[PDB]
Design an enzyme around this catalytic site. Sequence first.
Site, PDB file in Angstrom:
ATOM      1  N   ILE A  32     -10.018   0.936  -6.067  1.00 39.08           N
ATOM      2  CA  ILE A  32      -8.864   1.892  -6.161  1.00 39.08           C
ATOM      3  C   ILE A  32      -7.807   1.624  -7.127  1.00 39.08           C
ATOM      4  CG2 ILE A  32      -6.584   2.503  -4.934  1.00 39.08           C
ATOM      5  CD1 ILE A  32      -8.137   2.637  -2.365  1.00 39.08           C
ATOM      6  N   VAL A  80      -7.058  -3.709  -5.058  1.00 36.02           N
ATOM      7  CA  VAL A  80      -7.171  -2.754  -4.017  1.00 36.02           C
ATOM      8  C   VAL A  80      -8.674  -1.938  -4.143  1.00 36.02           C
ATOM      9  CG1 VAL A  80      -5.961  -0.852  -2.827  1.00 36.02           C
ATOM     10  CG2 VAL A  80      -4.760  -2.261  -4.588  1.00 36.02           C
ATOM     11  N   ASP A 126       9.876  -1.198  -5.698  1.00 34.70           N
ATOM     12  CA  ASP A 126       9.006  -0.963  -6.783  1.00 34.70           C
ATOM     13  C   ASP A 126       8.412   0.481  -6.811  1.00 34.70           C
ATOM     14  OD1 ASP A 126       7.599  -1.463  -9.245  1.00 34.70           O
ATOM     15  OD2 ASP A 126       5.962  -2.319  -8.277  1.00 34.70           O
TER      16      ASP A 126
HETATM   17  O1  LIG Z   1      -1.355  -0.636  -2.186  1.00 44.00           O
HETATM   18  C1  LIG Z   1      -1.187   0.238  -1.215  1.00 44.00           C
HETATM   19  O2  LIG Z   1      -0.279   0.236  -0.389  1.00 44.00           O
HETATM   20  C2  LIG Z   1      -2.294   1.489  -1.059  1.00 44.00           C
HETATM   21  C3  LIG Z   1      -2.750   1.708  -2.010  1.00 44.00           C
HETATM   22  C4  LIG Z   1      -4.040   3.096  -1.955  1.00 44.00           C
HETATM   23  C5  LIG Z   1      -4.014   3.408  -0.458  1.00 44.00           C
HETATM   24  F1  LIG Z   1      -4.985   4.405  -0.500  1.00 44.00           F
HETATM   25  C6  LIG Z   1      -3.468   2.793   0.415  1.00 44.00           C
HETATM   26  C7  LIG Z   1      -2.668   2.053   0.153  1.00 44.00           C
END
Ligand SMILES: O=C(O)c1ccc(F)cc1
Length: 264
Positions: free
Chosen positions: A10, A17, A112
């Site tokens: 992601i 992530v 942030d």
């Molecule tokens: O880093 C997070 O908090 C996060 C990033 C993407 C996602 F789909 C859910 C949480």
Amino acid sequence: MENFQKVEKIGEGYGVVYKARNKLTGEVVALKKITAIREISLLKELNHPNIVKLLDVIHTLYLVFEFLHQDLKKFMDASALTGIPLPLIKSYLFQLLQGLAFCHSHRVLHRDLKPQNLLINTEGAIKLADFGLTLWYRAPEILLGCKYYSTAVDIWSLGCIFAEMVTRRALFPGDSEIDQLFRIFRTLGTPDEVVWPGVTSMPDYKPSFPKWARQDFSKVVPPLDEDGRSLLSQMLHYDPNKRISAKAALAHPFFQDVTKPVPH
Ligand SMILES: O=C(O)c1ccc(F)cc1
Ligand SMILES: O=C(O)c1ccc(F)cc1
């Protein structure tokens, strides 16, 4: 961990992530691989429709979040030619002020906030993600070396983001801490003791900072109406103690005709 199958990266922040499938629940999740326990317990109890759910904490340190595909940055980019419709701007702004009011009344600061960190769904919701556990949305007290900052830092960041949805350009695209500071100063004027009592005592304040005049907000965020400019100005007060709270921002006249449109 063995109950999670990786689908794709992601993004990357503290850690990495992944989009992941939970083999136990069949659920698709965001898997973030990385004093701390009390901080992460406060995040795991923060449950609000405008806060991304922290589903699970696995210490073997993986944080399992609900997954949403789209974020505000991606949406701003795809919307760059026409712009986000003002009803949707106002709806996104109102929902983030709600999540922020909830956080702040539970003594949690985000620290942030940025478009990248704001997740959207198909039904018109927006959610605070990736809590602070690049410099464009940083409050001037943080840039001036203040270590004991307040909830007002999140309001400043949200003001920057509000301006950006309106004009389709970052408000203060700084590329170093001093360029960031000086971009704030060239627009809002160099702060002094009059507008910000205590500014000249901040750890990184220098009397040699050049003295810029303030620009009118009518130049800064056109075509935003007077209610939107009034609220933005109150989110962008230099003095953290003059900066409007998320709770008082919710009662602003700008939100009088707030609705919840479907993004498209
Ligand atoms: O880093 C997070 O908090 C996060 C990033 C993407 C996602 F789909 C859910 C949480
Ligand atoms: O902090 C403010 O909001 C502010 C700063 C300077 C100024 F001339 C007017 C307002």
